[PDB]
Amino acid sequence: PWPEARHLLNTIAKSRDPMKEAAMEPNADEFVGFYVPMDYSPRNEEKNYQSIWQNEITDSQRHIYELLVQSSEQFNNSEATYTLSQIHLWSQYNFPHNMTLAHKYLEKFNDLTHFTNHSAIFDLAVMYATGGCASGNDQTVIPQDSAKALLYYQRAAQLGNLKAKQVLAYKYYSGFNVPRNFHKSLVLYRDIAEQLRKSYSRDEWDIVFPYWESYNVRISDFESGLLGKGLNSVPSSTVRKRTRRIIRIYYAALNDYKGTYSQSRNCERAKNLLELTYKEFQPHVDNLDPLQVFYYVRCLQLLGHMYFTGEGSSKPNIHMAEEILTTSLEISRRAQGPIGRACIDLGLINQYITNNISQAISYYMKAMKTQANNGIVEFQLSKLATSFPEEKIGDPFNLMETAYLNGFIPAIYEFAVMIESGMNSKSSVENTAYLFKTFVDKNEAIMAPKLRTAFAALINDRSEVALWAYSQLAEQGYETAQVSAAYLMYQLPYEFEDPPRTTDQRKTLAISYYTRAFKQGNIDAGVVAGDIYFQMQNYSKAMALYQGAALKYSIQAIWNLGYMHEHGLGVNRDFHLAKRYYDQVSEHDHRFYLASKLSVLKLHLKSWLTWIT
Ligand SMILES: *[C@@H]1O[C@H](CO)[C@@H](O[C@@H]2O[C@H](CO)[C@@H](O[C@@H]3O[C@H](CO)[C@@H](O)[C@H](O)[C@@H]3O)[C@H](O)[C@H]2NC(C)=O)[C@H](O)[C@H]1NC(C)=O
Ligand SMILES: *[C@@H]1O[C@H](CO)[C@@H](O[C@@H]2O[C@H](CO)[C@@H](O[C@@H]3O[C@H](CO)[C@@H](O)[C@H](O)[C@@H]3O)[C@H](O)[C@H]2NC(C)=O)[C@H](O)[C@H]1NC(C)=O
Ligand SMILES: *[C@@H]1O[C@H](CO)[C@@H](O)[C@H](O)[C@H]1NC(C)=O
Ligand SMILES: *[C@@H]1O[C@H](CO)[C@@H](O)[C@H](O)[C@H]1NC(C)=O
């Protein structure tokens, strides 16, 4: 039965990505506010499943699905049962998802060699910790079970999977259910981090971090926001830079060198395009519009970084890089333009291909205040400080401390192993842990490569699988996944029409995600949690929550606060404090000057009537 099917699943060519398909082609360059549901309708998904598995499937595509499943039930293969979980849980080939049967077959895979394969036990160990999926109406449905999942996590990390021991460390570090226990968190964090540092090369560790494309972004920022407009915080989308022929080309290659969200990147067509430009312009180099040559030499900076990169080619060329960018500075003398990244990679290639350290300090130091310096320079210097104890440069400590904050990633590890090893007792113990996770969570490719899946396999269709993915990273320390999944589980109804028509369990999960996101910083989520409990009871819990938000300077919390005391369930009714709240909103913002005193108008309109009796 099976080994014939291997030819078929070879034939079908699944696990499709659209951004790779839009990398090459001319395209709309256009997407926003695409589509979402607001109600789940469990018994609707079953009939939709029925329709699609009736019609849109192919008769062959049934034929393959026929006998792996028919052969696996007749035969104990256990390889097809593992695949169909990854097919009805991932929708990896063109088939629907059904977490009931997927969950059902996962125990079958596990029982075959109970507790050996960490890649699977983890996946259902989440499924226990939710209770929302692997659910239904038949008998085997069970709600959430903490400990029964917890043990499986311990089995995986005991076996040695990474993100398991990650989520344990986060779970202690946050005080999710168990106590705080910073010590353990430190232990397994540093363990993880040494394994990560072992994943890389010496060369690749020291010279360039390889630019894995980032998706740790807070969905609902594409639309207005988690709430409204103007009264939000920190939109994390970073897309499609822009501010006279060539400049429209310049950006048009930059976007192709680092297209981040909706179109995959690679340099090759941008590169060929670029070298065409250098072969084109160079003899025709008079003045030529000092604003144009600006973007010319900027594309030269880029270009030299690309030859030294080795993108698109089989190898990098240090040499044509050398002539081309050294030329670039030969111009940059004239018009005194930006010079940074050329000074970096020039001071870097001299540092490992040649061995004139001396000038290399001159270049690094010549570009050190540059904005493009993230942390790379300092991290590269402190090496030479610890190697060559020379007075010229200062302490390694302060330099690496100037690289930590800026975001350059290797800087953390040295900055961490330093302080823990420090016979000099620096600030504390717990802060040390904050470093390690901040490294871990930021490497983002070994640990969390599925953000490129969840996003991707959302936009075509079928949010639910992305929802499971964020429901697999929300347990990790990724705020973005928490508010993402919750924003999929509960959208805010507009004031007019209607709240949703969803499950109560589902809300019991969403609220937990929003809460943890709140205590990772996103104040707005707190507000949203309160807007759940309007529809429920627990007005006291909500009041504590809102009140928890207001102390950190929000606004909507406050209007809800005065409004909760004036109308609805208040333990004591009072409008003295109320107008204070309603007025300090206008104290702080200066922009809602009217609605404050409007609330005052209705508030005294109460008094006019009540004096009648
Ligand atoms: C997930 O997969 C299961 C299959 O394990 C799908 O199950 C179907 O569930 C219905 C009850 O909702 C079962 O009822 C059947 O009704 C027909 C008449 O319509 C009757 O002739 C059968 O004897 C039975 O009573 C149905 O047998 C069952 N079929 C299968 C293959 O399981 C379920 O619909 C899927 N859900 C989702 C959300 O994908
Ligand atoms: C849990 O079990 C699954 C199978 O149910 C294991 O899948 C195996 O994963 C490894 C890679 O981690 C695959 O290795 C590579 O496969 C390709 C062909 O697909 C081959 O060309 C490479 O040389 C290499 O052997 C392996 O084939 C794959 N096995 C099956 C049947 O798909 C999974 O690895 C197990 N979990 C863990 C954590 O290992
Ligand atoms: C390179 O080093 C040699 C000897 O170390 C020195 O003579 C030469 O001036 C250096 N060149 C540059 C460009 O720094
Ligand atoms: C109130 O909140 C608790 C959570 O502490 C929850 O278990 C309970 O179901 C809620 N009750 C109502 C009526 O909302």
- Vertex 22, ends 20 and 28: CA angle to 5°? 155
Question: In this structure, are 139 and 252 located in the same domain?
Answer: no
Question: In this structure, are 139 and 250 located in the same domain?
Answer: no
Answer whether residue 412 is part of any domain.
yes
- Resolution, Å (one decimal): 3.9
> 488: closest CA among 454, 460, 537?
454
Cα Rg for the chain, rounded, in angstroms?
29
Contact 166, 172 (CB under 8 A): no
Smallest-distance ligand from the CA of 82: 2
Smallest-distance ligand from the CA of 161: 2
Q: How many angstroms separate the CA atoms of 445 and 452, rounded?
A: 10
Is the minimum distance from the CB of 237 to ligand 3 under 6 angstroms?
A: no
To which residue do tokens 């890389």 refer?
200
Question: In this structure, are 151 and 278 located in the same domain?
Answer: no
Contact 188, 169 (CB under 8 A): yes
- The backbone torsions φ and ψ at residue 563, rounded to the nearest 5 degrees and listed phi first, read -65, -45
To which residue do tokens 């312009």 refer?
281
Distant-in-sequence, close-in-space partners of 437: CB < 8 Å, separation ≥ 6: 169, 170, 173, 185, 189, 477
Question: In this structure, are 263 and 404 located in the same domain?
Answer: yes
Separation of 358 CA from ligand 3 center, angstroms?
8
Q: Determine the 3-state secondary structure of 28 from DSSP.
A: coil
Answer whether residue 210 is part of any domain.
no
Total domains in the fold of the chain: 3
Separation of 167 CA from ligand 2 center, angstroms?
24
Distant-in-sequence, close-in-space partners of 553: CB < 8 Å, separation ≥ 6: 588
Q: How many angstroms separate the CA atoms of 300 and 364, rounded?
A: 19
Separation of 62 CA from ligand 1 center, angstroms?
17
Among candidate residues 408, 428, 448, the one where a domain is terminated: 428
- For 214-281, what is the HEC assignment? CCCCCCCCCCCCCCCCCCCCCCCCCCCCCCCHHHHHHHHHHHHHCCCCCCCCCCHHHHHHHHHHHHHH
Q: Which atom of ligand 4 is nearest to the CA of 536?
A: 14
Is the minimum distance from the CB of 101 to ligand 1 under 6 angstroms?
A: yes
Question: In this structure, are 139 and 249 located in the same domain?
Answer: no
Question: In this structure, are 252 and 103 located in the same domain?
Answer: no
Q: How many angstroms separate the CA atoms of 554 and 558, rounded?
A: 7
Nearest residue (CA) to ligand 2, atom 28: 79
To which residue do tokens 């942390």 refer?
375
Q: Which atom of ligand 2 is nearest to the CA of 82?
A: 5
> DSSP letters of 554-574?
-SHHHHHHHHHHHSS--SS--
Helix orientation angle between 318-332 and 290-309, rounded to the nearest 10 degrees: 160
| Residue to probe by mutation, ligand 3, list 353, 358, 362, 364, most atoms within 8 Å of CB | 358
Contact 510, 483 (CB under 8 A): no
Is the minimum distance from the CB of 71 to ligand 3 under 6 angstroms?
A: no
Q: How many angstroms separate the CA atoms of 302 and 519, rounded?
A: 40
> 482: closest CA among 457, 443, 451?
451
To which residue do tokens 């109970």 refer?
114
Question: In this structure, are 144 and 269 located in the same domain?
Answer: no
Domain holding 107, by residue range, is 2-157
Question: In this structure, are 250 and 153 located in the same domain?
Answer: no
Answer whether residue 415 is part of any domain.
yes
Is the minimum distance from the CB of 356 to ligand 3 under 6 angstroms?
A: yes
Answer whether residue 127 is part of any domain.
yes
CATH of the domain at 107: 1.25.40
Q: How many angstroms separate the CA atoms of 146 and 540, rounded?
A: 26
Answer whether residue 192 is part of any domain.
no
Question: In this structure, are 359 and 262 located in the same domain?
Answer: yes
| Alpha-carbon distances of 382 from 13, 203, 363, 366, 398, rounded to whole Å | 49, 16, 15, 16, 9
Q: How many angstroms separate the CA atoms of 23 and 262, rounded?
A: 9
> DSSP letters of 49-98?
HHHHHHTTS-HHHHHHHHHHHHHHHHS---HHHHHHHHHHTT--SS----
Separation of 493 CA from ligand 4 center, angstroms?
22
Question: In this structure, are 299 and 424 located in the same domain?
Answer: yes
In this structure, which amino acid lies at residue 587?
Answer: E
Separation of 515 CA from ligand 2 center, angstroms?
38
Answer whether residue 466 is part of any domain.
no
Contact 58, 65 (CB under 8 A): no
Half-sphere exposure of 482 (CA within 13 A, CB side): 23
Q: Which residues, judged by CB distance below 6 Å to any ligand atom, belong to the binding site of ligand 4?
A: 536-538, 541
Among candidate residues 118, 136, 157, the one where a domain is terminated: 157
Q: How many angstroms separate the CA atoms of 194 and 389, rounded?
A: 27
Answer whether residue 508 is part of any domain.
no
Among candidate residues 394, 428, 462, the one where a domain is terminated: 428
Separation of 90 CA from ligand 1 center, angstroms?
20
In this structure, which amino acid lies at residue 85?
Answer: S
DSSP state of 325: H
Is the minimum distance from the CB of 359 to ligand 3 under 6 angstroms?
A: yes
Q: How many angstroms separate the CA atoms of 544 and 557, rounded?
A: 11
Answer whether residue 487 is part of any domain.
no
Q: How many angstroms separate the CA atoms of 136 and 11, rounded?
A: 34
Question: In this structure, are 15 and 115 located in the same domain?
Answer: yes
> 579: closest CA among 593, 600, 561, 560?
600
Smallest-distance ligand from the CA of 504: 4
| Residue to probe by mutation, ligand 4, list 503, 533, 537, most atoms within 8 Å of CB | 537
Separation of 323 CA from ligand 4 center, angstroms?
70
Question: In this structure, are 152 and 297 located in the same domain?
Answer: no
Nearest residue (CA) to ligand 4, atom 12: 537
In this structure, which amino acid lies at residue 594?
Answer: L
Q: How many angstroms separate the CA atoms of 492 and 228, rounded?
A: 10
Contact 216, 234 (CB under 8 A): no
Q: How many angstroms separate the CA atoms of 119 and 426, rounded?
A: 39
